[PDB]
Amino acid sequence: SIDSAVATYEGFSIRVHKYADGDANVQKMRFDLLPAYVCFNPHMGGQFFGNP
Amino acid sequence: SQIVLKKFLPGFMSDLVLAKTVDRQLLAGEINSSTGDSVSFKRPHQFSSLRTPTGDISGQNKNNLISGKATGRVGNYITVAVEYQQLEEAIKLNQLEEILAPVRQRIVTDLETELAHFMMNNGALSLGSPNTPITKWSDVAQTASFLKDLGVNEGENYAVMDPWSAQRLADAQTGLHASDQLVRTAWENAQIPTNFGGIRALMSNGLASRTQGAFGGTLTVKTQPTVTYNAVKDSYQFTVTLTGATASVTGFLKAGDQVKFTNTYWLQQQTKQALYNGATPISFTATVTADANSDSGGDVTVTLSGVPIYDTTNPQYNSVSRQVEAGDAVSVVGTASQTMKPNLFYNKFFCGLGSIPLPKLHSIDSAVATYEGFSIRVHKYADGDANVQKMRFDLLPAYVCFNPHMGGQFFGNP
Amino acid sequence: PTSLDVTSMTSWEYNWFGADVIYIAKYYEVRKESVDVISYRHPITGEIAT
């Protein structure tokens, strides 16, 4: 019972919701995303600098 | 006292003539999402000539180029809302169509009433004494005569009168001497013809009323106002201060009061000559816009619509015989505090009227209703868990006054 | 380097392991253009030939 849609950008899906407050007579939108991160093995990467 | 029929009893209705007569053409679909909340139209130019007897005069005192504006804007919202316990409402009242009929009528009635207030607040010209009602043929003919005398041709004149006044004219018409068609129509249907005295006379019962507002004392202007065309080339309104009033009264001058300047006359706008009303010259008048009070010492500062331009550097824009200066004597038409329903007269190109389309409100059920060319947006929702449904109706209007000197009020004279 | 288009169609109730696909699109347009026609009119073997 709320207008919504899905958009795609560079392999990521964003959900758009449109809703309004009737008494105040205001129209508004929100864009949402939910990420998730995992670290498999710490011994396979790090920070590198120019050694002296 | 238990069973109820499915047909409602008939009710009362007003009439629409003002919206149909006012100019609904110039301002139509120009207040969009691009222009903003206001838009302006241009004003015509005027020129003046010089009188010399020689010819190699390529270097002399020449005219100037000044352009005016007429701005139109939007008004407030006309919102009517209802709430109900929807099951109790639907006990015997199906499809929620019963509310639809008497809400568009309310919307239109309020629109027309405030439009009438706008016109009587912005009109400048006045005729006759407010006390006397309309009884004879000259009382209607004088409006057309004045409008012709000023010099307006491009446009279409009109006049509006109440129901009781028309019967008085129909009764006068029944006493004619040779027009069988006219006497027959007046005797049977009591209907006056379309063109009455050179102007179109209309009958309307929905018409706003105004209270005069208490005033007392010989009023006069204390300070010379600025009525130069450079100052008043955008609004045709000006602020003036008056003395000789009552000690301290709130609401000394209401909205719509007409102030007459005794020693300054109108001008035929083209030939730039004064106006002669058979026995006396016609005096200049202005209309109060906002309520004005009085402080101690009888000093009243008021803002009036309609300007007595007497610029001396741009003589081509003069519209009065002489300049208003300090010590001039002024009057206010009417009695102390009586309330009356004025009768109107105006040209086509006097004021405009338009409507702003309203888009759908997000995630809310809505619909559109049409009524004499007006579109009303209806929204329905159920805010709160009180099991109370809510509906709202929306309409937004836009109004413009093209030239205050092309309309006003008129009464009868003894 | 390799750049691919996106329309968000994969990852949809499937166990995906093959990330070695690059999506390329062929695009078709129709245009209204100006062309010049030359009419050969050799009498031998038919005259009008545009």
Query: Maximum Cα–Cα distance for chain C, whole Å?
Result: 72
SS3 content of chain B, % helix, strand, coil (to 5): 20, 30, 55
Looking at the DSSP assignment, which residues form a beta bridge with residue A27? A20
Nearest CA distance, B355 vs chain A (angstrom): 19
Collapse the DSSP code of B12 into the 3-class scheme (helix H, G, I; strand E, B; otherwise coil) and give the result. Answer: coil
State both tokens at B262. 């005794």
Contact call for B and C: 3+ CB–CB distances under 8 Å: no
For residue B208, give Cα distances in angstroms to B121, B164, B273, B339, B343: 11, 15, 36, 11, 10
Residue B182 backbone phi and psi in degrees, to 5 = -65, -45
Contact C8 A10 (CB under 8 A): no
Sign of CA dihedral B199, B200, B203, B208: negative
Residue B223 near residue B246 (C-beta atoms within 8 A) = no
How far is residue B336's CA from residue B257's CA, in Å, rounded to a whole number?
Answer: 11
Nearest CA distance, B363 vs chain A (angstrom): 5
* Window 12-31 of A, Cβ < 8 Å to C: 13
Residues of B with Cβ-Cβ distance to A22 under 8 angstroms: 361, 364, 379, 381, 383, 390, 392
Residues of A with Cβ-Cβ distance to B381 under 8 angstroms: 22
State both tokens at B198. 């050179």
Find how far residue B158's CA is from the centre of its chain: 13
State both tokens at C9. 């169609």
Q: Which amino acid appears at position A49 of this protein?
A: F
Q: For the CA atoms of chain B, what is the radius of gyration?
A: 26
How far is residue B317's CA from residue B308's CA, in Å, rounded to a whole number?
Answer: 10
Nearest CA distance, A14 vs chain B (angstrom): 19
State both tokens at C20. 């070695």
Residue B244 near residue B298 (C-beta atoms within 8 A) = yes
Collapse the DSSP code of B232 into the 3-class scheme (helix H, G, I; strand E, B; otherwise coil) and give the result. Answer: helix
This structure was determined by cryo-EM
Contact A9 C7 (CB under 8 A): no
Contact A20 B364 (CB under 8 A): yes
How far is residue B237's CA from residue A46's CA, in Å, rounded to a whole number?
Answer: 77
The angle subtended at Cα B112 by Cα B109 and Cα B117, nearest 5°, is 125
Find how far residue B272's CA is from the centre of its chain: 26
Q: Which of B363, B381, B392 sits opposite A2 (nearest CB)?
A: B363
- How many helices, marked H, and strands, marked E, lie in chain A? 0, 3
SS3 content of chain A, % helix, strand, coil (to 5): 5, 45, 50
Collapse the DSSP code of B144 into the 3-class scheme (helix H, G, I; strand E, B; otherwise coil) and give the result. Answer: helix
Question: E strands along B219-364, which residues?
Answer: 220-221, 237-243, 258-265, 267-268, 273-274, 276-277, 280-281, 283-288, 300-305, 330-332, 339-340, 343-346, 351-355
How far is residue B36's CA from residue B130's CA, in Å, rounded to a whole number?
Answer: 41
Find how far residue B404's CA is from the centre of its chain: 9
Q: Which amino acid appears at position B361 of this protein?
A: L
Consecutive H or E run containing C33 = none
Q: Which of B362, B379, B390 sits opposite A19 (nearest CB)?
A: B362
DSSP symbol at B10: P
DSSP symbol at B402: S
User: Which residues are within 8 A (CB) of B304 and not within 5 positions of it... i.e. 6 or more apart?
Assistant: B237, B238, B239, B240, B259, B286, B287, B288, B289
Q: Provide the 10 A C-beta neighbour count for residue B123.
A: 28
Residue B357 near residue B171 (C-beta atoms within 8 A) = no
Closest residue in B to A29 (Cα) is: B362
Q: At what angle do helices B180-188 and B163-174 cross, to 10 degrees?
A: 140
Residues of C with Cβ-Cβ distance to A13 under 8 angstroms: 8
DSSP symbol at B130: T
Closest residue in B to A3 (Cα) is: B363
Q: Which amino acid appears at position B191 of this protein?
A: Q
What's the first-to-final CA gap in chain B, in angstroms? 58
How far is residue B220's CA from residue B300's CA, in Å, rounded to a whole number?
Answer: 10
How far is residue B27's CA from residue B155's CA, in Å, rounded to a whole number?
Answer: 16
Q: Which amino acid appears at position C5 of this protein?
A: D
| Nearest of B283, B290, B401 to residue B332 by alpha carbon | B283
Best C5, C6, C16 member to test A by mutation, with max A CBs in 10 Å, is: C6
How far is residue B113's CA from residue B206's CA, in Å, rounded to a whole number?
Answer: 7
Best A16, A19, A30 member to test B by mutation, with max B CBs in 10 Å, is: A19
Contact B363 A22 (CB under 8 A): no
The angle subtended at Cα B292 by Cα B309 and Cα B18, nearest 5°, is 70
Residue B67 near residue B44 (C-beta atoms within 8 A) = no
DSSP symbol at C49: B
DSSP symbol at B230: H
Consecutive H or E run containing B86 = helix B86-90
| Nearest of B321, B137, B304, B314 to residue B228 by alpha carbon | B314
SS3 content of chain C, % helix, strand, coil (to 5): 0, 5, 95
Residue B340 backbone phi and psi in degrees, to 5 = -145, 165
Contact A22 B390 (CB under 8 A): yes
Residue B265 near residue B320 (C-beta atoms within 8 A) = yes
User: Which residues are within 8 A (CB) of B405 and not within 5 positions of it... i.e. 6 or more apart?
Assistant: B124, B125, B150, B236, B306, B319
Contact call for A and B: 3+ CB–CB distances under 8 Å: yes
Residue B217 near residue B294 (C-beta atoms within 8 A) = no
Collapse the DSSP code of B101 into the 3-class scheme (helix H, G, I; strand E, B; otherwise coil) and give the result. Answer: helix
Q: Give the experimental resolution in Å.
A: 3.7
| Nearest of B200, B238, B236, B203 to residue B221 by alpha carbon | B238
Contact C6 A8 (CB under 8 A): yes
User: Which residues are within 8 A (CB) of B412 and not within 5 positions of it... i.e. 6 or more apart?
Assistant: B128, B129, B132, B133, B134, B135, B136, B139
Q: For the CA atoms of chain C, what is the radius of gyration?
A: 26
Chains with 3 or more CB pairs under 8 A to chain B: A
| Nearest of B313, B272, B338, B380 to residue B133 by alpha carbon | B338
How far is residue B300's CA from residue B257's CA, in Å, rounded to a whole number?
Answer: 14
Q: Which amino acid appears at position B371 of this protein?
A: Y
At CB < 8 A and 24+ separation, what contacts does C4-9 make? C6/A8, C6/A9, C6/A10, C6/A11, C7/A8, C8/A6, C8/A8, C8/A11, C8/A13
| Nearest of B26, B119, B27 to residue B354 by alpha carbon | B27
Within B291-341, residue ranges assigned H as helices are none
Looking at the DSSP assignment, which residues form a beta bridge with residue B271? none
Collapse the DSSP code of B392 into the 3-class scheme (helix H, G, I; strand E, B; otherwise coil) and give the result. Answer: strand
Q: Which of B362, B383, B392 sits opposite A27 (nearest CB)?
A: B362
How far is residue A12's CA from residue A32's CA, in Å, rounded to a whole number?
Answer: 11
How far is residue B380's CA from residue B392's CA, in Å, rounded to a whole number?
Answer: 7
Residues of A with Cβ-Cβ distance to B76 under 8 angstroms: none
Q: How many Cβ contacts (< 8 angstroms) between chains A and B?
A: 25
Residues of C with Cβ-Cβ distance to A9 under 8 angstroms: 6
Residue B63 near residue B388 (C-beta atoms within 8 A) = no
State both tokens at B271. 């030939």
| β-strand pairing of B80-84 with B280-281 | unpaired
How far is residue C9's CA from residue B202's CA, in Å, rounded to a whole number?
Answer: 69
How far is residue B249's CA from residue B251's CA, in Å, rounded to a whole number?
Answer: 6
Residues of A with Cβ-Cβ distance to B383 under 8 angstroms: 22-23
State both tokens at B215. 């005033």
Nearest CA distance, A46 vs chain C (angstrom): 24
Question: E strands along B188-257, which residues?
Answer: 195-196, 199-203, 210-211, 220-221, 237-243
